[PDB]
Each structure stands twice: as C-alpha cells, then as structure tokens.
Amino acid sequence: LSGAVTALILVIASVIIALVVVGFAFGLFGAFTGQGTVAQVGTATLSASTLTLTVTLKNTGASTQVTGVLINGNSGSVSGMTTISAGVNTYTITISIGSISTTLRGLVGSTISLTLILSNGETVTVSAIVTS
Amino acid sequence: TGVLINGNSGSVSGMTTISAGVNTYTITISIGSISTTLRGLVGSTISLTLILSNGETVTVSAIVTS
Amino acid sequence: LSGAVTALILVIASVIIALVVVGFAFGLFGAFTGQGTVAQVGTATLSASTLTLTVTLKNTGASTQVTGVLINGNSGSVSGMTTISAGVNTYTITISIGSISTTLRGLVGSTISLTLILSNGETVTVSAIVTS
Amino acid sequence: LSGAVTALILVIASVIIALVVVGFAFGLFGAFTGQGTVAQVGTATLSASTLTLTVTLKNTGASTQVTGVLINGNSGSVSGMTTISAGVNTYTITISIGSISTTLRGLVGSTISLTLILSNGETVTVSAIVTS
Amino acid sequence: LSGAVTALILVIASVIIALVVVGFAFGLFGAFTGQGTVAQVGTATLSASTLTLTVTLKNTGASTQVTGVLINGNSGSVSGMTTISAGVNTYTITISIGSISTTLRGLVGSTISLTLILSNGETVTVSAIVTS
Amino acid sequence: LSGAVTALILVIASVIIALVVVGFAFGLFGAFTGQGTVAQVGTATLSASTLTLTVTLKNTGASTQVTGVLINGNSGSVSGMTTISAGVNTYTITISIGSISTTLRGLVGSTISLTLILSNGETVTVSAIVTS
C-alpha cells in the first residue's frame, strides 16, 4: 500500500518543482529582455580645455548608471549626469583623469574614440570630436 | 495581466482577452513616466514583454511610430 | 511514475519557450527590415542670408523625425518640416545656431557638407551649395 | 523527481556560462577600442649626417612602444624616445643600421618613406625630408 | 518503500553527472582560451639566395610548433627555430623545397605571401620582401 | 521499481533522439557544402542582332539549372543550354524578351551587366561586351 502513497507524493513534488523551474525560466526571459540597452545616436563633443563630454545616448531598457570612462590610455571617473534615463537624451559628463589634463589640447578638431563602462556590465563605444 | 517596457511595468486597458488562433490586438498601455519619452524614438525598434495570466511572458518586437 | 510526468511537463515547456524565441527572432527580422532608411537624392541648397536648408530626401522605411543638424562646428536645432514622410520629398528646414549667423555669408557659391541627426539613430551626410 | 533537479542545475549553469561569455565579449569591445592608434601629423626630418628621425606622431590610444624601423632595405633598431605617449608629440629617434651609414648622404633635400614597427602589432608609414 | 530509495539514488546520480558535465564545460572554456594565437607583427624577409625566412611573430597563447610552410606552389618542410615561444619574437626559419630553389632569384625586391601551418591547427598568413 | 524502468526508457529514447539530431546536422553540413557555386571566369559576348549570350561559367558544385535572365529592365526566359555541368564551360544561351529586340542595336561595342537566376536560388552577376 505504501507504493502508491510514495508514487503520489513523488508525482506532486515533481509537479511543484517543474512549475518552479518553468516560472524561473520565464522570469529570466522577462528580466533579460528589459535589462537595458544603451547606444549612441550622434557624435559626441569632447571639450579639451574643460575635458567635458557631451554625448547623446539612447537607452531602451532599465535605467542604468555610468560607472567609468575609458579614454586612450587611462580609465577615469565621471562627475556629472551619471544616471541614464530611458529614451534619447543629451548627457554632459565631466571626466576626471590625472595625466590626460592638457594632453588633448593638441588634438582640437580631430576625432577620437571613448568607451563608457556602464553599471549593467555593458560597455558603449563612443565617437567624439575634440573641441576647445 | 501586465506589460513590461524599458524600465517600468504598467497596466493594460484594452483587448486583454487573448482568443485562440492568430489575431490582431490593440492594447492601450498606461505608465506614468514613459509618457512623451518614446517621442524621441520614432522609427526605431524596441522590445517589450507581455506578462500573461498563465505565468508565461512573451517577448515582442515593435517599431515605434507616431 | 513521476519521472515520465516530469519529462512531458519539461518537453511541453521547452516547446512553448522555443516557439516564443522563434517568434521573437522573426519579429526582429520584420522590424529591422522596415526601420527607416534615409538618403539624399540630389544636392541641397543652404541659403546663408536666412540659413534655410532645402534638401531632397528619399526614405524607403518608417516615418522618422529630424532631431538635430550638424554644421561645420556647431550642432543646432531645426524648426521646420521635421517629419520625414515616406518616399522622395523636398524639405525646407530652418536651422538655428547662435554663432553661424552671417558666417556662411563669405561662402556663397561654394560647396559644404552637413549632417542630419535623425530620430532613428541614423545620421545622413548631405552635400549642399551655399547661396544667398 | 531527478529530472527537474537536473533541469534546474543545467539552467543555472547555462545562465552563468552565458553571462561569462557576454562579459568577455564586452571586455573585448572595450579592449579593442582603446588599443592604440598611431599616425603621422606632419612631415618628418631625417638627418642623414647623424641619421636621426624627428617625427610628429599622433597616438589616440594606449601608450605603445617603437620596436623597430624599416628604411629602404634594412630593418634597424632605434635608440631614443622609444615610448609613444598619448596625444600629439614630436619624437627624436636615433636610428642604427650597419650599411645605411653615409648612404643617404646622396639624397639631401629629397623625399623618402619609412615604416615604424610598433609594439602593438601596427605599422606606421612615415614620409620624411632628408637633411644634413 | 523502494520508490523513494530509487528516487534518491537517481537524484544523487543526476547531481554527480551534472557536476561532471559542468566541470567539463568550464575546462573546455579555459582550454580554448589559451590554445595559442599566432599572428604577424611586421614584414618578413625571404632571402632567395639561401631561401631563409626571417619573420616577427606574436604568440599570446600556448607554445605551438611550426609544422609546415606553404609557398606559391609547393608545401615544404622547415629546418630551424620551429618552436614558437610566447610573446613577440624574431624567428629565422630555413625552408626546404626541391623546385623553388633559384625560382625566387627573379623576384628580388618584390613582395610575396606565404602561409605557415602550425601544430595547433592554425594557419598564419605572412607577407614578405624577397631579398638576396 | 517503476522509477528506474522509466529512467532507462527515457535514457535510451533520449540517446536515439540525440543521435538522430547529430546525423541530421552532419547531413546538413555535407549538403550545404556541395550545393553548387556558379561564377564567371571571363567576359561574356552578347550578340545584339540575334540576342545570344556566350558566357564562360565555372560551377564547382551540383549540376544546377538556369531558370531566368535579368537584363537592364526586363526578366526574360532562356532557350538554350539551360543545364550547367560541373567545371568550367562555355555556354551559348538564346535569350527571349519582347521589347529588348533591336534595343541593344545602339550599344554595339559597349559593356553591359546581366544577372542569371539559377535553379538553386543563387544569382550570378555577369559582364558582357555587346556585339553584332
């Protein structure tokens, strides 16, 4: 008689566990779909006298952060408008590096490529015109 | 039961009932902040999620128009 | 007995999930195909006395917008016919920059290159004759 | 009952592995963006009496090295200012070849083309005026 | 009573097997990452009188071997510095083909392209100047 | 006792199914490799008086067919040597269009570009000299 009791107990436990796994899979779907996709929608302007990056970013996911910046050699901090809203927006970020100060002064008018290290593990490649 | 756009989850207010077969549904979404946020994405692609009553989430791709 | 129940539950869940993924992939196809492709089909005219750009644009995709303009140094707003219908059309856009006013007055008759920053993340390179 | 346990074990392992791969891909992005781009921004001067190359180089990436030089026939070593900082800078490199000594003495005033072999796998083509 | 005994036996077997599979997957990751990446970081020199290839190779993976060479028509053996250490290094490889002897003697000064067949399944394309 | 029976039944069924899938994948490999690659290996001659295309085609795959032709405006049928053997061969195809008759008569000596729509879904771009 114990055999059928064990059979039912195991059947119901397996059903509960399978439903848990399926719910987890669909939660993973919904979470990865809306994780946050940040890209560039136009050229940036890198003021070399003040070292200020004005960039237009498009974010069609969750509201992420800007944790770091990667310029030619050094990775520097950021000190302005770190919060990336959703949609398309123009952000004005003040970059802080030790050595790059006055290094760009000899590049006014030329193009440059930066990287933005976001909080959600994504890195964004940015193109900019160096100005003064 | 619900919709999931870039940041926020919002209610739906139309044709919530999914009949069987293939059908074209016109769902009115309601979020507080996303109002006028998509106005700068006209023409671009976007990805949404639909939270159904049977525990299944459906991933949808959409073109943003105006 | 529970093993086969679990097996069928997982099989059906996997079928549902795979169908969801395939539908999403084909939706992505159809969405990226008709996202909006804007190009130039003839030289533009940049009136320097009024700073007005008359340009013929071809758009074989979705109806986009014109968010910004990029002239030699500055990025400026636009204040006319920002909506790009489908097909080939002649648009008359009034550009607004602070300093470029009366700067092109010494370029009448010469060629120039502008950029149009569209709402769908695309930038269009435009060539124009500067007139007055 | 074991089926669903195995299913969740594999699901979580797959999520971990996929996240690892995605992080690696974005790291590759960030690394290749700032790998180091060196070009020339003005004519060089090749002193043929002392065989010294004075060249103005622009480097908008990581700080690379100058490992070799390639003049008409021979590849020779360099013995000065091997380190290329970031930005635009004027470098005075002392080249050393066995045979080219006194060979350029018959080219004073004419043009010549060199190659620079950098540490980051990139070769830079340089143009120079031979002087004395 | 046997049902639950079988259930636990199968559960522990499944956990052991899944852990084996996951460990094997991560080992595959670590192994394919450091398998050996060999490329060229500067033009090679192909001495046509002695038929000797002086080439600068960059290898950022495991220490591979040079098993064969592929010149214009024929694949030939190699007889020197077959072992590719890690890093950037200058290798002097003596090639041996029966027919190509004295064939390059009419190509001095021109450019040529060779292939190196490595031990780790990778073929490396090399560009060289033919000298004498 | 039923649990282990179920486990082995599912194990053998899964092994059979996995082997079926792997066999199908390798069949897909072998089938896509030898599908038929048709290209041009020399200029074609388009006789405008008789409207006859003499073209040398190279096909290193399966023996495909020529289902249609695409000339400047119209898509026309073919009425000769529709079968493409393997190897390099010179084919003489009689094209049939309603309007193009006597239209090429004003292009004798000039170059033109055609398209061949093959049976295997591949289109081949051809260049031809218009003759008479």
Numbering used by the authors:
A (entry chain K), C (entry chain E), D (entry chain C), E (entry chain I), F (entry chain G): 1 to 132
B (entry chain S): 67 to 132
Sentences from the paper on this structure:
Although the full spectrum of functions played by archaeal T4P is yet to be uncovered, they are known to mediate adhesion to various biotic and abiotic surfaces, and play an important role in DNA exchange, intercellular communication and biofilm formation. Finally, we show that Pyrobaculum and the Saccharolobus T4P are at the forefront of virus-host interaction and are recognized by two different viruses, likely serving as primary receptors during virus infection.
This was a rise of ~5.3 Å and a rotation of ~101.7° for the P. arsenaticum filaments and a rise of ~5.0 Å and a rotation of ~104.6° for the S. solfataricus filaments. The small difference in helical twist between the two resulted in 7-start long-pitch helices that were left-handed for P. arsenaticum and right-handed for S. solfataricus. However, in P. arsenaticum pilus, there are slightly more than 3.5 subunits per turn, so there are 7.1 subunits in two turns, while in S. solfataricus there are slightly less than 3.5 subunits per turn, yielding 6.9 subunits in two turns. In S. solfataricus and S. islandicus, ~37% of the residues in the globular domain are either serine or threonine, potential sites for O-linked glycosylation. There was no apparent glycosylation of this virus, and the small extra density not explained by the atomic model involves a few disordered C-terminal residues of the capsid protein that were not part of the atomic model. It can be seen that, as expected, the S. solfataricus filament has a significantly greater amount of peripheral density due to glycosylation than the P. arsenaticum filament. Whereas binding of SSRV1 to S. solfataricus pili is likely to be mediated through carbohydrate moieties, direct interaction with the pilin subunits might play an important role in the case of PFV2.
